[PDB]
Amino acid sequence: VIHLDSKNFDSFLASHEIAVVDFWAEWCAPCLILAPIIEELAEDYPQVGFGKLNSDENPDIAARYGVMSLPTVIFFKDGEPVDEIIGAVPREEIEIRIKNLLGE
Numbered sequence: 001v002i003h004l005d006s007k008n009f010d011s012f013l014a015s016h017e018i019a020v021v022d023f024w025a026e027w028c029a030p031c032l033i034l035a036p037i038i039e040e041l042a043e044d045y046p047q048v049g050f051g052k053l054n055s056d057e058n059p060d061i062a063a064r065y066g067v068m069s070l071p072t073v074i075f076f077k078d079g080e081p082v083d084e085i086i087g088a089v090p091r092e093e094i095e096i097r098i099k100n101l102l103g104e
Contacts, residue, residue, distance in 0.1 A: 001042045002051040005058055010079070012051050018101045019049035019076040020094070021065075025056045028070045030088035037091050038073075041098070048098055077101060 002012055004021065013019050022038050024031035035052075042050035055062035055070060065074055065081060074084045075097055082101075085093060 001039055002049065004051040004053040004061075006061060009053075009061065012049055013076055013079045016047065016049040017078055018047075018098065019051065020098065021074045021076065022050070022052050023055050023062055023065070023067045023070060023072040023074070024052055025054055025070055027056075031071045034071050034073075034088045037094070041091065041094060045098055045102075047102065075101060 001022075002008070004012055020038075020041075022031075022034065024035070026032075038050060038052075042048075053061055055067060062072075065072075067074075069086060071088055072084055072086050073089075073094060074081045076082065083097065085097075
């Protein structure tokens with residue numbers, strides 16, 4: 001899971017066709033529930049880019065992508081935000097989306 005900021009955001013998005021960005025902050029309890037879920041998914045899907053964007057540290061990037069509450073997980077294809085989930089959710093909601101994006 002890549003630590004994201006303005007400097008590496010685009011190169012991250014280009015590293016895999018499909019990318020998953022977890023918008024989070026340390027004060028956000030549901031975000032910290034989600035952290036291990038995302039970390040374990042990253043290990044299971046090495047063909048997908050996973051990154052964490054801390055909204056306290058990068059408020060302009062969160063705002064840019066319309067993130068108004070946390071957690072928000074945004075799914076990218078070819079650098080385009082194509083879908084998102086707002087809230088902590090089961091692994092299986094994130095996984096089903098990843099599989100569809102991969103054409104599984």
